[PDB]
Amino acid sequence: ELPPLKLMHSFCAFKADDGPCKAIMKRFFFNIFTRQCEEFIYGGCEGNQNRFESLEECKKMCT
Amino acid sequence: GIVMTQSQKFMSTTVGDRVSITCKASQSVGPAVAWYQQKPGQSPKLLIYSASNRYTGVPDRFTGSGSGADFTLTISNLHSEDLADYFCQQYTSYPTFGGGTKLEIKRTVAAPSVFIFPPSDEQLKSGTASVVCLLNNFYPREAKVQWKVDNALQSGNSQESVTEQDSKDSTYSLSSTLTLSKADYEKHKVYACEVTHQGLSSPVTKSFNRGE
Amino acid sequence: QVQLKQSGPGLVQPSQSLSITCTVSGFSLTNYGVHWVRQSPGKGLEWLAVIWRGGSIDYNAAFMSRLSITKDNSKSQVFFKMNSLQADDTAIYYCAKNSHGNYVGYAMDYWGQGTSVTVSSASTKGPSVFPLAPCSRSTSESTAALGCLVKDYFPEPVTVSWNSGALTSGVHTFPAVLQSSGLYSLSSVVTVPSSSLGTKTYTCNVDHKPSNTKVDKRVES
Numbered sequence: 126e127l128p129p130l131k132l133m134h135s136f137c138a139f140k141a142d143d144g145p146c147k148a149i150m151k152r153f154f155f156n157i158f159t160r161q162c163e164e165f166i167y168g169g170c171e172g173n174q175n176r177f178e179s180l181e182e183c184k185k186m187c188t
Numbered sequence: 189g190i191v192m193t194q195s196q197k198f199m200s201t202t203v204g205d206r207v208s209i210t211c212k213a214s215q216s217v218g219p220a221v222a223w224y225q226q227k228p229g230q231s232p233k234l235l236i237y238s239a240s241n242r243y244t245g246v247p248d249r250f251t252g253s254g255s256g257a258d259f260t261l262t263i264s265n266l267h268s269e270d271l272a273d274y275f276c277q278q279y280t281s282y283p284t285f286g287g288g289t290k291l292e293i294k295r296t297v298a299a300p301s302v303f304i305f306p307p308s309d310e311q312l313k314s315g316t317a318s319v320v321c322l323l324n325n326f327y328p329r330e331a332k333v334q335w336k337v338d339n340a341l342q343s344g345n346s347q348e349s350v351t352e353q354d355s356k357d358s359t360y361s362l363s364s365t366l367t368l369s370k371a372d373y374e375k376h377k378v379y380a381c382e383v384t385h386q387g388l389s390s391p392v393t394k395s396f397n398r399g400e
Numbered sequence: 401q402v403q404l405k406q407s408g409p410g411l412v413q414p415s416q417s418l419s420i421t422c423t424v425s426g427f428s429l430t431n432y433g434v435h436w437v438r439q440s441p442g443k444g445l446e447w448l449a450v451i452w453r454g455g456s457i458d459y460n461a462a463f464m465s466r467l468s469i470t471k472d473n474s475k476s477q478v479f480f481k482m483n484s485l486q487a488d489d490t491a492i493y494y495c496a497k498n499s500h501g502n503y504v505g506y507a508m509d510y511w512g513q514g515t516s517v518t519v520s521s522a523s524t525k526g527p528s529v530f531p532l533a534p535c536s537r538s539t540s541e542s543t544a545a546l547g548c549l550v551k552d553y554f555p556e557p558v559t560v561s562w563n564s565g566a567l568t569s570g571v572h573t574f575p576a577v578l579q580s581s582g583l584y585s586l587s588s589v590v591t592v593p594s595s596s597l598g599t600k601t602y603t604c605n606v607d608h609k610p611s612n613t614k615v616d617k618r619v620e621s
Contacts, residue, residue, distance in 0.1 A: 127402070127427065131241050133219060136505050144281070146461055170461040171189075171281040174220065174505035178452045182502055222499075222507035231511035232445075237499055243509060275445060279505045282460060283435070285445035301591075303545040305532040311551075318549055320532055322589055324572070347585075349575040363574040363587045365549075396535035 136174035137187035144171035153177040155187035162187060190214050192276050192286035200294040201266050209261040209289045211276035216256045222277040223252055223261045225270075226288075228352060232275065236261065266291075271353075295358040299387030300326035304380075304394040307373065317373035319366040321381035321394070325359040332384040333364045336393075338376045342366060373398065402426035404434075404495050404512035411555055411610075412485045412519050420515050422478040422495035429453065429471055433498035434478045435508050436469070438517075440491035451478060453502045485519045492516050518555045522582035526613025527553035529606050532589065533621050544597055546619050547589035548604035552581070553611070560588040561605045567592075597621055 137155040141163075148169030155175055156163045162183035167176060177183035191214040201207050211221070223236040234243045236252035239259060249264045263270055271293065276286040300323035307317040323331055329350065335342035348364040364381065380395035408420040422434060433452040439445045449459045451469045459467055466483040478495060493515045496508035532547030550558055560573045567590060576586040588604055606615045 128244055130500050130506070131238060132500065132503070133238055133505065135218065136220075136503075146459070146464060148464075150456060152456070169457070170459050170464060172458075172504075173280060174503075176504050178454050178456050178502055186503065220505050231494060231514055232496075232508075233511075234499065234507050234509045237507040243499075243507075277445075277507065279507070282458065283437075283447040283508075285447070287444050301543075301545075303534055303589075305545075305547065305549075306535055308530040308533075308549075311528070311530045311549075314528075318530070318551065318585075320547075320549060320587060322545055322547070322587075324545065324589075324591060347577040347579070349577055351572050351574060361572045361574075361589075363572075363589070365577070365585065365587070367579075400535070 132186065133174070134187070139173040139175040141165045141175065142172040144168045146170035153180050153183040155183060189281060189284050190217060190278050192278055192284055194274075194276060194286040194289045196289050197287065198290050198292060201271075201291050202294055203266055203268055205266050207263045207266050207270075207291065209274050209276075211254075211259045211261075211286050213257045213259070213278055217278040217280050219255055220279050221252070221254065221259045222279070223250075224275045224277065224285075226273045226275065235274075292353050293358045295327050297387045298325060298327040298359055300324055300331065300362070300383055300385055300392075302381070302383045302392050302394045304396060306379065306396050306398070312370050312373070315370050317368045317370055319368070319373075319379050319381075321364045321366075321383075323362040323364075323383055323385070325354065325357065325361055326385055326387060327359045328386065329360045330386070331360075331362055333362070334382040334384070334391075335364070335366045336378075336380040336382060336395075337366075337368075338378050402497060402510040404497060404510060406493075406495060406512040406515045408515060410515050410517045411524075412489075412517060413521055414486065414519060415484045418480075418482045418485055418489075418493070418517055420480040420493055420495070422480065422512055424476045424478070424495075424497070427497060429473045429476060429478065431501060433502055434471070435496045435498060436480050436493065437496055437508070438489075438491040438493045439514075442488070443491070446491075448482075450498065458504070485517070487519050490517060490519045516556065520555070520582060522554040524610050525552065525554050525583065526608045526611035527551055527558060527606060527615070529604065529615045529617045531617065531619040532587065533619060537594065542594055543591050544594040545589055545591050546602055546621075547587055548606065548617055548619060549585070549587050550576075550606055551585045552579075552583045553585075553608050553613075554583045555610055556584060557609075558584075558586060559607045560586075562588075562590055563601075563603055564605055567602070
C-alpha cells in the first residue's frame with residue numbers, strides 16, 4: 126500500500142487561472158476571498174496548482 | 189512554459205565525494221520541483237519532490253534544496269550505483285524537465301588504440317564499401333577522426349558513434365564509418381584514419397592500401 | 401507493488417497515428433492520475449498530458465489538438481493516441497503514475513517501461529552482416545581487433561553477442577547510426593589476444609527480431 130506523501134498547502138493560495146486554451150472543463154479552486162472552494166472553467170492547458178477535479182478534493186486539500 | 193536549465197551536461201566525479209547538481213528555472217516556481225535519476229535503457233526514477241522531500245526508500249545521502257528559481261540536488265557520498273543521468277522538473281503551469289546532468293567517473297588520461305578495417309569482399313560484391321576506424325578505450329571522451337583517401341581530406345561521408353563509459357575501466361570507445369561506392373573505392377589506393385586525442389602527443393594515423 | 405506495462409506497436413508511418421495501452425497494477429485509476437511523457441535525444445523529456453481519476457484531461461498546448469486519452473478503470477487500462485506523427489515525434493513514450501493522488505503540482509513516481517516509437521516510411525528489413533578484420537597488425541601487438549558490421553536494417557533494435565555469449569570481455573557494441581537511406585548500421589568489435597587468432601574461433605551472433613533475422617557470422621583474422 127502506498128504511503129502518504131507530503132502535500133503543499135500553499136497550492137491553495139493562487140488565483141484561479143483558466144489558461145490560454147479553449148476547452149470547457151469544470152474544475153474547482155480555493156477562492157482566497159470567499160474562503161470557499163468554487164467551480165471554474167478550465168481551458169485544458171497551463172494554469173496553476175489551485176485546480177482540483179472535484180469539489181470534495183478541493184475541500185480536503187484546502188479547507 | 190517554464191524552462192528548466194541544467195548548466196552542466198556532464199560532471200566528472202569520484203566515488204566517495206560530494207556532488208552537487210544545479211538547476212535554474214526561467215522564473216520562480218516556488219517549491220514545486222522534483223528530481224529524477226535515469227540510467228541507459230531504463231525509465232526515470234523519482235528521488236525528490238517539492239524541492240526537498242526524499243521519495244520513499246531513496247538513500248538519505250540524497251538532499252534537495254532550493255526555492256524560487258535555483259535548485260540543487262546533492263549526493264553527500266557518491267556511490268558507484270549513483271552514476272546516472274539526473275533531471276530536474278517543475279510542475280506549476282505544467283510539467284517541464286531540465287536537459288539532464290550525466291555523472292561520469294574521473295580517471296587518468298588514456299590514449300586510444302586505433303584500428304582500421306577495410307571493406308569485406310562480401311560487401312564489395314554488392315556495390316558499397318564501408319571502411320571502419322575503431323578508437324578503443326580512451327579517456328576523456330573528446331576525440332577527433334579525420335578520414336583521408338589518397339591524402340584527400342574526406343568531409344561529409346562518414347558517421348560515428350561512441351559507447352558509454354566502460355563499467356570496468358571507465359574509458360570510451362568510438363567507431364567511425366566512411367561510406368563510398370564500390371566504383372569510388374576502387375579508384376583509390378590509400379585509406380587512412382587520423383586520430384587526434386589528448387593522450388596522443390601528436391596525431392596517429394592507421395592506413396591500408398586497397399589490395400596489399 | 402506498483403507496475404505500469406505498456407503495449408502497442410512503435411513503428412508509425414508518416415502522418416499516421418500512435419496507439420499505446422498502459423496497464424497498471426498495484427494502484428487504481430480511480431485514485432490516481434496517469435501522465436504521458438516522451439523522451440528524445442533532440443527534445444529531451446517532454447510532458448504531453450495527464451488523465452485524472454474522474455477522466456478529466458490536462459494537455460500540453462502544443463499537442464492538444466492531436467491527442468486522445470481514454471481509460472477503462474475496471475481493466476486498469478489507459479489508452480494513449482496521438483495523430484499525424486512526423487519524423488520529429490520519434491521518441492520513447494512513457495506512461496507514469498502521479499505521485500500525489502489526484503493533485504496537480506508534484507511528480508511522477510512510477511513509470512512504464514517505455515515504447516520506442518519510430519516515425520518512418522522505411523520497409524522492415526534484416527541486416528547484412530560483414531566481417532571487420534584488419535589488413536595487418538604489428539608483430540609486437542599482443543592484442544588484436546575484429547568485429548562485425550551490421551548494416552542496412554530497419555527498424556531498431558539489433559542485439560549482438562560474441563561466441564554465443566561466452567565472450568564478453570573486450571566487447572564494444574556501438575550505438576547504431578541512421579543512414580541517408582533510412583536504414584540503420586551498427587558495429588560490434590572485440591579485442592582478443594593476437595596469439596589466439598590462429599587457434600580460436602570468433603563468431604558474432606546477430607538477432608533482428610522485427611524481421612525475425614538471426615545470423616551467426618564467423619570472422620576470420
